[PDB]
């Protein structure tokens, strides 16, 4: 695969198996599974208070206080409705499904439950896209610490929306490979002019983030997406959010795939070298 | 004069023959199996644990199958391990004077037989076998029991350390099951390194120490830096959790505790014996460590007098039958001299340690 | 704890190999003014013949060796790309071996296109002196 | 080529001169057989180390002995991506230094790769084949580094166009 | 000893 | 492992190195009659579906060679009872198969010649041939009532799945 | 005329008197004796007593005895008293490995060059029926690589890794008689340095020495691609030729003026020593035929050159062995006809 | 940290992947990769259930008998295990991987190079599967019976291993291999259904032999009594299997008869299917325990642990225990009869332990091991990989007794 998926596979598989066994009419089985996703979030699928007819899906994020200030609760009430309940202990957003009360088309609720982290993330994008569409300029930027040392800055202007990722590469080989990938990201204008404008800054913040206490280091990159009203309005808003909330994981995934392909080529050249060296023996002729 | 018989009461093998023999006439392992035979070794570190099995082995040597000699018409020279207790020394003499009644009995220490096989009479013998390591100074053909030192490191501990080192390389070895295989690996591949920093740099930067060994189940393992690290427990005992000093420092301590006039004879006549002294590079390492100790603790720093210190450690290339060759040489030069050999007249009339040998 | 294995006692040996040099200087290095006079007149072959005379093979100081190497490298850098072969073929076998020693000394100090002409000098000296001159470079006890 | 062929010719001639080895037991240690260019225990058994340089950054260093020879190669690294690809290639091949029988686990300081060839490798392999292998190595390392750089650039182009396509 | 059998399926 | 006969007593005749056991055959032969309801043919039919999969067999008693021969003839019978329609056609085919001449112990082409020994003379050879013919005829007669069904005109597929499986990779015909 | 014995290297070889059996060591701790069953070689005998790598084999013809020295600091004398060869241990009293061994011309002594900076001259004592060694150690500073005996059974040449070729006197009064006067000197006690050469600045390790037929000339090859001849009659003068080839590992004086050497160039070469004191290269003896892998018979370095014919008084064939595992026999009458202008 | 570790167990047939602290694996996928047979074209591949039948793709199996054959396919398999199924950022999660028995240290160094130099994991533990099966057997017994000494019968989709483990360490010289597992059983069931039944399509014949084996198979005490049960009352025992055709969809019904008990019979009679091997499994276990040292044999007899998917038959442990008891009492009776010296040796208790998590026993042992707080004191971190090198993953320290 090239593009990363948005839906979590474990939630979709577990809820599809549970809803198929509920639609078949068999007895429900217990579930207690805790797992994780990208950007250090936690998921817990369980049975609340031991009742096997109820399935509770809970997500814990370390940065839910920043998302809660930008209207996450209204979007989670809008996109889920009656399934949204009070949160579990130690978890931020909880969802409840009752196996006796299920719709006929169970694909849509499974597909919405697989997009739980996306629906948590989408509220700041919806708020600032509505700020840009209504012309409400001069608002404060949104700072989301989606990781421990990585940051996200969302700003709305008169004719553009600016999304800045501040990302940290672990090793210097990843710094050089990421500079190659971002240099090809800067010259992305060959695929027409409808693409968003991508800017890259190595080791230094951009000039708009100068009053802020941004991080300066040898392993820190700043990536700016400039989004136009063709990527902002409601005809293509959700696709823009789906593409833009997974970009850091996309970039690090392709850096690691590049290093694995380099390992494949070095394995082939090492095998050729060992064949040339083993042809030099008089015993093997 | 007659024929003077000789037999070696070793832990591993029994070799018997006559006086003046250049080679041992009858060599056989000490296997005594009871019925598909339950073999029990009667010798543990030179100390007898099963005297009836040793008596049956002595009947096998004295029987018609191997030697076919009269028990009361021959002179016999036996072997004794160093630091032997006096109760076993009385017991073997009482067994050989009561149960067989030999006319000539002379039990000898193996250190003076090792020095007699090289034609020497004064020197230090370092004997490392399977159980323990002895250092024995012998002056004018007589051993010195107040200067004999004991170090509890031998080939069993080196084999156990090699098992522990090969477990850290990722090979599944068991201590109670794969002992003989790693013992064969130790006998085939291990050696004593000269300079340990140089050897560790060579093992870490190059691949010239890597050797392949084929296991009995067909797997091929690669032994690299463990070839010199396993015999380094002889010089650094804290690698195998033994509170000691090492073999070279013990040798320096037991030579420097002797008389002032006898140090130069001891320093030029150091003889290695035993199966655990057959590692390649051991006398060069011993000479280097003794010269370092003589620089540090005698000359106190200056190197101008280091060239006057002469040390020659000579290991014989014929090390397989050294003790029996020394016993054959001693029985050959004392073939007619029956005053040294104890007789039955002292045995009937209150044999006190065979009249003090 | 030990404090005695950190002394190399092989340095203080009575049977260690000493080089046993005879001494002298070998008339130091070549003359600077003579080879500059040969260079200013255009006689590159005579400058090569003068620059290879009296090497500092017996001197202990590194300064005369570096001066002689700089003189021979200044002669060899100032050569053309066509008259190398006739300059090499004018020398005898000892001159070819000393030229090979100076080429392998001048390989250690690159400066722009110095190595790009030292490779051509190495090719011509290998063609006129064989593989044994490199072995005499490798087995020289006293080096330039 | 411009200046690659005389450089490889000089390296081939020096490798023919230096790979003349024989079996030699140790003088200082009893019954040891060590490569004398590594232990450095006797100064009489060492040859003079020689250097062959193409430019200021690209050179080999050949240091021989009675029974061994160390050949240290520094490769051409034009920029940062070729530098990290060269370092990854040297780590990859030195991790497999028991399959290459003539390779060191660590380089000497200031050089990228280093071969150690003993007299046993000259006994069980033809020595002119070993010289041809070292020259073949010095060509194919640069060819594989250039191909890996081109592959990384093409992959980055396709990844950037694929992400900006879907907007 | 024997333990009979169950004529069913999992 | 494999299954052996338990119908051996010391009051039994021994022909060759095989055994001459009593059977309840209506056909004539040198074997005596048996008052008991269990015989060597019934035991071999009871043990055939387990013993046909085995490729190593150890001779424990003298009736085991008789069990091996009846098992081999059962494997020969199922190779010819595959291509039939009714029970009476199968009885005619098994009577045709029982009248044929198979290789005796001693002739080439007969398997397990290392285990089976030669007959002593001509009369013991005739007694052994008549005993094997009576065993073959009662083997076919006993198998014809168990291959087919009360829902007739169909041989059962639970017996016709053992056609291509041979005892110890050996066959009487070849 | 090349025969491929093994794929493993041959460290050393030794012929008997009839040139019918050859003793090899195929790079391990064993000696293989091959005899020629008609027109092909078969492995007759196998001798195994060393527990280390065998570095030298010599065969005394008239007494018909095989001496072997190895890296286990040991030497054995093998005698064929019955159909099986029997070894006898020699006490060398060395602490380093033995590198070379050679019999005396009268076959009463043999000389072992070792890495302990000694030369062990061993002679047989019948009082206790074993071999006693005496050491020559005073000017030698490194490992002795090659040895060669003088025809008068007293003097001994030795090349070593301290870049010197020396001539010693190995006169043992228990076995030998009084030596006559030689141009190398008059006073010959045991272990006395008669002469020493090798001072040329760029010293190389002397890999091979050889005395002449008369014994008044001595040739040696060195690791700096040099071949030198010292003449004792002409005021002990040394003439050195610097070759443009790879270094030579073995040398042999074929006649009084011709010397054949071979080495890492995988090809035997012929040098001429004139009476005026001039050493000139004549020709390579492995010129490939043209009819229009390496272009030599040996694919690896030639390590040993010996005389297959009736030695230095009249030589017609010589035998070369090397690391490629093959033995080559070269004939002078074919090489003087294939190569034009060659008269030796 | 707060994030649980990732436990991946790559087998020859099935890869079990999930997060630590869970009872069941999150994904049990087939261990195959479908590839396309310059550019981004090495990312055009599928793994698992999407890699079985694709029209333009070729299916490769990188793991044969536990040993990884192709390392590029294994690296791409780990790429889509991490980034598509687990969805874990690999720089934040510790990893527990498994290795086959008698694995070379070079394979551990290759796995460590793949894990550290391509995915940049903070830590990596490579675990022996027999110790994990012994750890997973602890959730059936009491708290005083939790030891690390026992015999592991690992039977999957390859060679069945009999592994003796003494005090958490594997006695490598007494491991034996039986060439019978689930592929041989489904091949035998496929041959029986080919000989008897009709109507099975030839492109689904391996599939319907699988579902007969996983749903209808058991073991039997006696073959002759079972054949008499199936022949006399042949309506209670003979079942029906209904399947759907892949092309031209039609329900076909077959009679599942004799192959229910003849399926798992080839463990105890290996000459039914395998020509070369004829030694039954109880003789192999008896030979393995008799080749062990004498001071450990009775703990090995007292604790025999079944693991793997091919040990998931009804009463398999009961018949293994009965056959091992009747072959271990024969030696005691022979010693009492041939000697007769009134020695009277102590009777040996043979106990085969069957537990609930027997199918994914290796994954459950890894999940219970990686959930402990001591697991971060036994891993090899990336700092130790950069300092020392890849030689730290040659040795992995055995975990102590905990829970
Ligand atoms: N070539 C060898 N190199 C190293 N160790 C060896 C070699 N041969 C044997 N050993 C070891 O030496 C020991 C045997 O020594 P030795 O033959 O002297 O035994 P021993 O006489 O029975 O000993 P002891 O008298 O101390 O009981 C064993 O540990 C064996 O593994
Ligand atoms: N009742 C059953 N339930 C599940 N699987 C079964 C059952 N009976 C047989 N099997 C077989 O078990 C096999 C699964 O074994 P397993 O997954 O342990 O193999 P593996 O990949 O070799 O694993 P490993 O070597 O890690 O133990 C499949 O071939 C499946 O057909
Ligand atoms: Mg002993
Ligand atoms: Mg498996």
Author numbering:
A (entry chain D): 1 to 285
B (entry chain B): 5 to 39, 67 to 388
C (entry chain G): 8 to 151
D (entry chain F): 2 to 168
E (entry chain H): 20 to 29
F (entry chain E): 2 to 175
G (entry chain C): 2 to 293, 318 to 369
H (entry chain A): 3 to 39, 53 to 418
Task: Please quote the authors directly.
Cortactin coactivates Arp2/3 complex synergistically with WASP-family nucleation-promoting factors (NPFs) and stabilizes branched networks by linking Arp2/3 complex to F-actin. Human cortactin is a 550 amino acid protein, comprising N-terminal acidic (NTA, residues 1-76), six and a half 37-amino acid cortactin repeats (CRs, residues 80-324), and C-terminal Src homology 3 (SH3, residues 492-550) domains. The NTA (referred to here as Cort1-76) and CRs bind Arp2/3 complex and F-actin, respectively.
The cryo-EM structure of Cort1-76 bound to Arp2/3 complex was determined at 2.89 Å resolution. Cortactin binds at the interface between subdomains 3 and 4 of Arp3. The binding site consists of a hydrophobic pocket, which hosts the side chain of cortactin residue W22, surrounded by positively charged amino acids (R230, K240, K244, K251, K254, R275, R329, R333, R334, R337) that create a favorable electrostatic environment for interactions with negatively charged amino acids of cortactin (D20, D21, E23, D25, D27). This site also binds the A domain of NPFs (NPF-binding site 2)6,31 and the A domain of the inhibitor Arpin41, and thus constitutes a hot spot for interactions of different Arp2/3 complex regulators. Therefore, cortactin interacts with Arp2/3 complex through an inverted A domain. The structure of Cort1-76-bound Arp2/3 complex displays the inactive conformation.
